[PDB]
Every structure is written in structure tokens, then in C-alpha cells.
Amino acid sequence: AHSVKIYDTCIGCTQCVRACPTDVLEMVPWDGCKASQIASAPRTEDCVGCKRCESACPTDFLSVRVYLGAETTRSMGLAY
């Protein structure tokens, strides 16, 4: 499906996980920020490409990036 990437600029605010409508992102332990956590995308095959996770990231430029592509059945959001 689409490709979702997380960068070291993340601050572990979890706001991208809460905005995801298909449960693609999750928070994992990390040691590069004060929050001691970082976002991750273990199940991007369920990603639809809404980039709501991108709109919720507060860093200057996005620590979470969605690149789109493939456009499989789950990606197109088809119920038929």
C-alpha cells in the first residue's frame, strides 16, 4: 500500500496515532526525546493515504511522512 515513514525529529506526542482512522501507527519505546517514545507504522498495508497523521504532527516539518502509491483494495477505501 502506501509508505509511511517516521523521522528522528519526532517528539512522541502521540497526536499522529490518535488521528489515524485505520490504526496504522503506534507508539514504541525510544530514547531520542523527552517523551521516551517514537511513532512507528508496522501495518501500513491498512493505510488509506488521508495524511491526517501529517496534519496532527506539530514539528516544523513533519516527523511522519506519507508517500502514497500502490492503491490496493484497502488503500482505495472500497466497501464493494
d(CA 53, CA 79): 23
Provide the 8-state DSSP code for 40.
E
From residue 17 to residue 56, what is the string marking binding to another protein with x (rule CB under 8 A)? xx-xxxx-xxxxxxxxxx-xxxxxxx-x-xxxxxxx--x-
For the bound state, the minimum distance from the C-beta of residue 55 to another protein, rounded and expressed in Å, comes to: 8
Cβ atoms of residues 41 and 25 within 8 Å: yes
For position 72 contacting another protein by CB under 8 A, the verdict is: no
> What are the grid coordinates assigned to 32, written together?
531520542
Binding-site residue ranges for [4Fe-4S] cluster: 10, 13, 16, 20, 47, 50, 53, 57
